[model samples]
Target: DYEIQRERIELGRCIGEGQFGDVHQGIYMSPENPALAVAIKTCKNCTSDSVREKFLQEALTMRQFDHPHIVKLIGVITENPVWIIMELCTLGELRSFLQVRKYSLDLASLILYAYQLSTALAYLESKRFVHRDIAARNVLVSSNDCVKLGDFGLSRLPIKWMAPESINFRRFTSASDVWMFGVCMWEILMHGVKPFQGVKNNDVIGRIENGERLPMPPNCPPTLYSLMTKCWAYDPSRRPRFTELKAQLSTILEEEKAQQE
Candidate 1:
């Protein structure tokens, strides 16, 4: 566990707030040199040891991770209220980024982003780690169009994008992540459109159980649509592994290039 010195972190204005706590834009002065801009997620209400440990897991999980598409954990402060510091993603959350760029976005850009996300997931699979929360909101986009996965939080109750097994049995596996990846892909193509359309939160699980899957986005290629449906397969075992997905997406991108020529 890398505990950062308290004096080194200067928290700025709060950028966002979520179920855990507030995230602030901050400056982190590491011993070696120039101050680095960072995002600091603070859990002010974490008084109990259990709560603090849970909050620290995000830093612990990411400390050794070094994938280009994975967010880097700078360090953590755990003395009183916990703070998890990470590299600042210039463009912010992927969902919001896509919304702003929706008008100018093309299918090729979407395919590239999807491929990058799958590449991150494939790396996670290789490391034997499962990202229980895989959604557009949890992904960060850099100014240069780089996608980085973040927010390795503890698993909570199933949400709208969770797999059927996660909702019913509290199960989490690479397959469950595959389910969310498909939903995330939908969000990207739809410009952050909510999945399940008009279905309420309570009814999402039921709809999934009843074999209802999200409709393909307008202009979505048949091949890409096929991959999304495969990811949302009712049988967990039937879902393609991230490696297979990465290969298929790569081929799709290559074919798109050939067509453009």
Candidate 2:
């Protein structure tokens, strides 16, 4: 349903890269918007008809989702060197953004970020979509009070952010996604320091098997930490659903805000 003309887009500098090629920050010239900020994923592998078919196939998957806290697909370019356009997150990825404003961002702000993501995950869960990979690095900051989930990272899977079942059985589900979300919450509270910092990938599973969970970030409230723990339940069935997480996160966000003021 969404397709943009090649002449309409003005590519900007390289912002990042995807599995198939480079990504860029760009401006989309529309009748309504002379310079609409957009993020573009450029495809190097889309040179042949066979390659073009696959690119269109996956871009369709990208276009189907609609959520305020999840990045929206702008449109696609079907020609050679295809470009997948998405809404630009002005502040960029959550990890580095949190790292840069470590002290500037308040605790209530961090808690609100976790709550916003839970709402998105809950929406995806209701649609029966399994994220497989969820982390702070995969989230983007749109504005001071807004964070949105981004990029599937088709070329990615980090062992540290995976659930035990996902690691050993190649199994993934909403429950496993919750586990990663728990870690993502910790990352936000920790001002984006990664989980198991400096720990080798080889030993991550062993640590999880032995019940080693992430430590609470400094100044993290007891209630928020308690909610995060529920997401890390080792048994997939034991993990809280994203619906449950969304409800709890809202409560936590309210409490944090109350105390701040």
Candidate 3:
């Protein structure tokens, strides 16, 4: 494990902030004594150690996955104030990037990102984990445009809503994540805009519970539009599995890639 010294962390302006805490760009000297960029997040310290424990727990959970699409959890500091050390990507989250681009993701770009995310989801499902809150806000892009899924605060054992035969939260399943993947695809195309525009969480839940799903935006391709609708299905059993979804995306991306070549 690499140990980052306090003074060695030359933090820059705030790049991102979340309910748990804010992220800053830092400059660090590599072990060979070379300068390198880093990202650091500081969580609120708890008096009884609950907050600290949660931070450590989440960090440890992230450490288990070593896939390229998954962010690498370097280490953590568990003193009075907890600190999380992680791999520093070129940009913050996909939200800011889309915000600057004006919410107009083309079919090729959307399929590219969607395919990578599905690959990551498939990898996690293989390891028996479900990322309940998969969103653009949780995705980070590197300088090379590689997308890595981050933030596992809401991830948990698969909820029953994801089961093929019986939708229950007994364990984390890939199907539940497929539902999330649909939401994520919508976010990418909408430039981070959430479903139901101004609808409240309760309303969103109510609609989903009642089998009412929002319409796909105009920019979504025909195939993708169909895919997203399947994801928002009220009955979890009706949603497509990641394996099937991945095949769709892979086929879509391969065609796009071939055209580009």
Candidate 4:
């Protein structure tokens, strides 16, 4: 269900560096459809069988998810030089794109980004997938107005975005994902500045324990900030489920749009 041929793909220039190796833009010459533009995640060292075993786990994780707002796993080339083919998000990484458009992009579009990701998270929640981190730096801007959950979080831990339970007990649940999503939403509101910037990772857990949630981003709706607080409730069980978050976010988006016109 998740394998592609080496001969079918033509690799393009490197897009960025990833934990595994260089990530490249590519064309998948599909027999059925028109030529598919894709991104190839290269494996730096898949020499040993165990190394090959370790790398494909990431691809397998992606294979289970098929939401419109989540990046899709196209297939895998499992021979000597391993590679994971994934759907390319053409615009840029969400943070870089948002930062560039800070003055030009309006509030409605930002709120829409938050709503789109909620749908993706809600789908992952239904699947019982515990997305370890959710943040702007990791998400991809597929279009000027569209963001999709992508593969970069496969790289680093966002300690400032982690929930208390995840920090204390290494527990990762859909609830914990909600906590991270709150921070991610805050990032969107800030137009790319990180949550708790200038704070050290080692100190973040203490700040969280003392109820130091992120302050409302400037011009962010009070009601929207209220939802972010619900996501950061001290008890994981107190956090809103991704399903509820999605529903509430859609309404919030509609309200924002109604006010715009």
lDDT by residue (tens digit), candidate 3, 151-248: 57522212212322223334434566677688788878777676566565444555666766656766666777788888766566788878788899
- What lDDT does the true structure give each of the candidates? 0.84, 0.87, 0.69, 0.87
The digit string of per-residue lDDT tens for model 1 on 1-261 reads 578998999999887785578888889988888789998988867888877887887678788688988888888888887888888887788878888888887778888889999999999999998888888778788654577886565223437889988888889999999999999888888887777766678899888888888988888888998899999998899999999999999998888878878
Off by over 4 Å in 1: 46-48, 154-158
lDDT of 3 at 50: 70
TM-score of each: 0.90, 0.96, 0.83, 0.94
Deviation from native of the Cα of residue 244 in model 3, angstroms? 1.8
lDDT of each residue in 11-106, candidate 2, tens digit only: 999988877788899999986768899999888978877877776665677677789898888899988778888899989989899999998999
Candidate 2 vs. true structure, TM-score: 0.96
Candidate 2: segments with Cα more than 4 A from true spot: 153-155
- Please write out the lDDT profile of model 4 over residues 1-261, one tens digit for every residue: 677989999999998887678899999998799799999999889987787887888888888788889999999999978999999999978888889999999889999999999999888878877778788888998897788998732545568888888888999888888999999999999989988878999999888888788999999999999999999999988889888998999999999899868
Best by TM-score: 2
| Candidate 3 lDDT score relative to the true structure | 0.69
Q: Which window of 10 residues has the lowest lDDT sum in candidate 4? A: 151-160
